[PDB]
Every structure is written in structure tokens, then in C-alpha cells.
Enzyme design. Structure first.
Site, mmCIF file in Angstrom:
data_model
loop_
_atom_site.group_PDB
_atom_site.id
_atom_site.type_symbol
_atom_site.label_atom_id
_atom_site.label_comp_id
_atom_site.label_asym_id
_atom_site.label_seq_id
_atom_site.Cartn_x
_atom_site.Cartn_y
_atom_site.Cartn_z
ATOM 1 N N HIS A 78 0.824 -1.215 0.000
ATOM 2 C CA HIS A 78 0.000 0.000 0.000
ATOM 3 C C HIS A 78 0.848 1.251 0.000
ATOM 4 O O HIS A 78 0.535 2.209 -0.663
ATOM 5 C CB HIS A 78 -0.996 0.022 1.161
ATOM 6 C CG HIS A 78 -1.862 -1.200 1.228
ATOM 7 N ND1 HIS A 78 -2.478 -1.605 2.391
ATOM 8 C CD2 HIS A 78 -2.219 -2.103 0.279
ATOM 9 C CE1 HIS A 78 -3.161 -2.713 2.167
ATOM 10 N NE2 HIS A 78 -3.023 -3.037 0.892
ATOM 11 N N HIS A 237 -9.433 -1.601 -4.611
ATOM 12 C CA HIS A 237 -8.320 -1.959 -3.757
ATOM 13 C C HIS A 237 -7.403 -2.958 -4.457
ATOM 14 O O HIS A 237 -6.188 -2.897 -4.309
ATOM 15 C CB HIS A 237 -8.739 -2.526 -2.405
ATOM 16 C CG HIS A 237 -7.557 -2.765 -1.535
ATOM 17 N ND1 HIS A 237 -6.988 -1.758 -0.783
ATOM 18 C CD2 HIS A 237 -6.767 -3.852 -1.385
ATOM 19 C CE1 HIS A 237 -5.901 -2.223 -0.191
ATOM 20 N NE2 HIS A 237 -5.748 -3.492 -0.521
ATOM 21 N N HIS A 264 -1.036 -11.114 -4.738
ATOM 22 C CA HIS A 264 0.356 -10.680 -4.714
ATOM 23 C C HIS A 264 1.333 -11.704 -5.244
ATOM 24 O O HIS A 264 2.381 -11.337 -5.804
ATOM 25 C CB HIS A 264 0.714 -10.268 -3.293
ATOM 26 C CG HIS A 264 -0.038 -9.061 -2.848
ATOM 27 N ND1 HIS A 264 0.102 -7.845 -3.480
ATOM 28 C CD2 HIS A 264 -0.974 -8.885 -1.886
ATOM 29 C CE1 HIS A 264 -0.695 -6.962 -2.906
ATOM 30 N NE2 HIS A 264 -1.359 -7.567 -1.939
HETATM 31 C C1 LIG Z 1 -7.331 -7.495 -0.093
HETATM 32 C C2 LIG Z 1 -6.371 -8.606 -0.042
HETATM 33 O O1 LIG Z 1 -5.810 -8.593 -1.260
HETATM 34 C C3 LIG Z 1 -7.049 -9.921 0.060
HETATM 35 C C4 LIG Z 1 -6.297 -11.075 -0.303
HETATM 36 C C5 LIG Z 1 -6.924 -12.336 -0.250
HETATM 37 C C6 LIG Z 1 -8.345 -12.437 -0.089
HETATM 38 O O2 LIG Z 1 -8.975 -13.657 -0.136
HETATM 39 C C7 LIG Z 1 -9.123 -11.303 0.214
HETATM 40 C C8 LIG Z 1 -8.450 -10.078 0.316
HETATM 41 C C9 LIG Z 1 -5.362 -8.353 1.041
HETATM 42 N N1 LIG Z 1 -6.042 -8.205 2.323
HETATM 43 C C10 LIG Z 1 -5.423 -8.595 3.560
HETATM 44 O O3 LIG Z 1 -4.405 -9.200 3.619
HETATM 45 C C11 LIG Z 1 -6.248 -8.520 4.809
HETATM 46 C C12 LIG Z 1 -7.295 -7.639 4.880
HETATM 47 C C13 LIG Z 1 -8.040 -7.525 6.062
HETATM 48 C C14 LIG Z 1 -7.563 -8.161 7.193
HETATM 49 C C15 LIG Z 1 -8.335 -7.949 8.399
HETATM 50 C C16 LIG Z 1 -8.995 -7.771 9.371
HETATM 51 C C17 LIG Z 1 -9.857 -7.551 10.532
HETATM 52 C C18 LIG Z 1 -10.577 -7.397 11.421
HETATM 53 C C19 LIG Z 1 -11.504 -7.221 12.501
HETATM 54 C C20 LIG Z 1 -12.834 -7.124 12.080
HETATM 55 C C21 LIG Z 1 -13.880 -7.176 12.982
HETATM 56 C C22 LIG Z 1 -13.498 -7.184 14.325
HETATM 57 N N2 LIG Z 1 -14.539 -7.100 15.285
HETATM 58 C C23 LIG Z 1 -12.165 -7.217 14.747
HETATM 59 C C24 LIG Z 1 -11.151 -7.352 13.824
HETATM 60 C C25 LIG Z 1 -6.558 -9.111 7.105
HETATM 61 C C26 LIG Z 1 -5.821 -9.235 5.923
HETATM 62 C C27 LIG Z 1 -4.556 -7.059 0.847
HETATM 63 O O4 LIG Z 1 -5.132 -6.019 0.836
HETATM 64 N N3 LIG Z 1 -3.132 -7.117 0.662
HETATM 65 O O5 LIG Z 1 -2.445 -6.169 0.164
HETATM 66 ZN ZN LIG Z 2 -3.967 -4.509 -0.219
#
Ligand SMILES: C[C@](O)(c1ccc(O)cc1)[C@H](NC(=O)c1ccc(C#CC#Cc2ccc(N)cc2)cc1)C(=O)NO
Ligand SMILES: [Zn+2]
Ligand SMILES: [Zn+2]
Ligand SMILES: [Zn+2]
Length: 296
Positions: A78, A237, A264
Site C-alpha cells: 500500500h 483496492h 500478490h
Molecule cells: C485485499 C487482499 O488482497 C485480500 C487477499 C486475499 C483475499 O482472499 C481477500 C483479500 C489483502 N487483504 C489482507 O491481507 C487482509 C485484509 C483484512 C484483514 C483484516 C482484518 C480484521 C478485522 C476485525 C474485524 C472485525 C473485528 N470485530 C475485529 C477485527 C486481514 C488481511 C490485501 O489487501 N493485501 O495487500
Molecule cells: Zn492490499
């Protein structure tokens, strides 16, 4: 000519690592011509520097990690997306821990820091990598492609079948001739599926994640109270993520990236695959900016 760009001033922020949940101090600093972006773990003794280049990527599960030996800098995508968007060629990034702070989950806080630091033009031509031939990589039904394009375009398609995604666009093709990275891409937050986040937390991972730094969806609804920043925030995103990975090429791109359910790992496979084939790209400069298919 289009010149290289660095920061005018040193600037700082703090936040927490998405994976670790612990406070990390971030510093962005100007750097000389032809430095590229270099990360330094200033908590270590000796301090360890890792250039942000494709050849230094280790792990790519969910995030892009730079590695040198046993030393890591996780979650670089990011911040690098913001560097790429604003056309910053040269900067030092200092970190007091092994992960860039997640901030608000988007590239926006980094755009904010870079802009606030100020932009400094440097006395050397900016180099661009122009895609000459289409190159692709695949894994299962996932695909990532570089395509020749007279400009800079990033396209992406996601294909989620869960109810919460039904009817959503799940696709965007952004031509930066007429789209603002800052205003229309950079603030897209990371997202996660509730079941996947639960699994991570069950293993003491994703400790820094919250609804204040991620969009979280269950099978059926977006959990965040305030909804979305952009109507198509999820695919935006993914576009953000791809632009950050792209910057590991070390120079701005003249071409198009197309992603299909990509992440990624595939993005980085694509970079290494492109780099290896010298027939498929070339480095160009523009002694006359008006003749350039991009502008910064
Ligand atoms: C967007 C992305 O590319 C990605 C990759 C694989 C996928 O299957 C989905 C998204 C990938 N996303 C992440 O690695 C990712 C995103 C979110 C979180 C989290 C969290 C939380 C929480 C929480 C929520 C509710 C409560 N009550 C408390 C805590 C962890 C990791 C990314 O953006 N990478 O660059
Ligand atoms: Zn990301
Ligand atoms: Zn489902
Ligand atoms: Zn490879």
C-alpha cells in the site's frame, strides 16, 4: 524532460502492523537520484536495508514481503502503491519493526505523507519501463497480464460468488490519462472475508486488523457501519494492490496490467517473468514531456 522525483522533507507517522498488532514507527526520507525505494529496519543492529525490487520479494501470501536473509519487511504494497501513484522514484523508508503500519488499510495515509513531505524534482531523467509484448502468468483460474499500452492503465476483475458481492461491479479498468490515482484509487481500503479473518485470529495472526483499517464482509453483508468510500471499493483496492506490486519493477510503467482474480503471488510471478524476457520490455526516457503518454 520528465525528471526523477524524491521528497522535499523527512516525514513521520506511527501505526500498527496488520499481522503483529504492535506499534511501528515509519519515516519517509529523500534519497539521491537512481536510489529507488529502499526500506531500512532501523531497529536492528546493524541496520538492514532492503531495496524495493522484485528480486527481493519472499513471501506473497495475502501481502507482499521483502526479505534479506532472515530479515523481513512485510506489507509493503500500500505504501509502494502511493509511491508509484505520485511518481516518487527515490526515497528511504525507515521502519522500527518488520511490517509497514496498516494505517487505514488504504494507500491514502501514504499519499498524505508523501504530499505533505513535498515533491522535489531531481536533475536526472525519469526512466520508464515500456511493455513491448504481452506477457502473462496463471495459476488455476487466476491470471495476471502485462499488455502494451500507450499510457498507463490498470484493469482488474474479481469474481466472488458470495451473496455480499452479488450485483457488485467486480471490475474496473482505469486509464490514468483521465483518472486520478489520488482521488479515485488511493483511498480504497483493504478487505477481508469474516471467516478468513477468524481463521487468522485463531492462530494469533491479523492482530492489528479492525473495522477501522479494513472492510470486513461476511457471506452476506458489509460489517463496517459507514459503507464504502467508492461504489466499487473492492476492485479498486485490488487495483491499488497491483500498482504497489508493479512498483517493484523499480520504474514507472508505460503499459497496461490486467488482473483476473489475481493476488500478490501471481503479481510477483508476473514481474519476474517480464523482467527475465528482455524482448518484452525496454527502458525509455522523455527529453520532451509533451511527447509522453503519461504525466505526473
Ligand atoms: C485485499 C487482499 O488482497 C485480500 C487477499 C486475499 C483475499 O482472499 C481477500 C483479500 C489483502 N487483504 C489482507 O491481507 C487482509 C485484509 C483484512 C484483514 C483484516 C482484518 C480484521 C478485522 C476485525 C474485524 C472485525 C473485528 N470485530 C475485529 C477485527 C486481514 C488481511 C490485501 O489487501 N493485501 O495487500
Ligand atoms: Zn492490499
Ligand atoms: Zn460464499
Ligand atoms: Zn517466477
Amino acid at each position: 524532460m520528465i525528471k526523477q522525483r524524491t521528497l522535499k522533507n523527512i516525514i513521520r507517522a506511527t501505526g500498527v502492523g496488520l499481522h503483529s498488532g504492535e506499534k511501528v514507527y515509519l519515516t519517509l526520507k529523500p534519497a539521491p537520484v537512481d536510489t529507488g525505494i529502499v526500506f531500512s529496519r532501523t531497529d536492528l543492529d546493524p541496520v538492514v536495508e532492503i531495496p524495493a525490487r522484485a528480486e527481493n520479494v519472499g513471501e506473497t501470501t495475502m501481502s507482499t514481503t521483502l526479505v534479506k536473509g532472515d530479515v523481513k519487511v512485510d506489507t509493503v504494497e500500500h505504501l509502494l502503491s502511493a509511491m508509484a501513484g505520485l511518481g516518487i522514484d527515490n526515497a528511504y523508508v525507515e521502519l522500527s519493526a518488520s511490517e509497514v503500519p496498516i494505517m487505514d488499510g488504504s494507500a491514502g495515509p501514504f499519499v498524505f505523507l508523501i504530499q505533505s513531505a513535498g515533491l522535489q524534482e531531481q536533475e536526472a531523467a525519469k526512466k520508464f519501463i515500456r511493455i513491448k509484448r504481452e506477457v502473462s502468468v496463471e495459476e488455476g483460474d487466476k491470471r495476471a497480464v502485462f499488455v502494451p499500452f500507450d499510457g498507463f492503465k490498470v484493469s482488474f476483475e474479481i469474481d466472488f460468488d458470495h451473496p455480499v458481492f452479488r450485483g457488485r461491479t467486480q471490475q474496473a479498468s482505469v486509464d490514468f490519462s483521465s483518472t486520478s490515482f489520488v482521488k479515485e484509487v488511493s483511498r480504497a481500503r483493504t478487505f477481508g472475508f469474516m471467516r478468513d479473518i477468524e481463521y487468522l485470529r485463531s492462530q494469533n495472526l491479523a492482530l492489528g486488523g479492525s473495522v477501522e483499517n479494513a472492510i470486513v464482509v461476511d457471506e452476506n453483508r458489509v460489517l463496517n457501519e459507514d459503507g464504502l468510500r467508492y461504489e466499487d471499493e473492492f476492485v479498486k483496492h485490488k487495483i491499488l494492490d497491483a500498482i504497489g506490486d508493479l512498483y517493484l519493477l523499480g520504474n514507472s510503467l508505460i503499459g497496461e496490467f490486467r488482473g483476473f482474480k489475481s493476488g500478490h503471488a501471481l503479481n510477483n510471478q508476473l514481474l519476474r517473468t517480464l523482467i527475465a524476457d528482455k524482448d518484452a520490455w525496454e527502458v525509455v526516457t522523455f527529453e520532451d514531456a509533451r511527447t509522453a503518454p503519461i504525466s505526473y
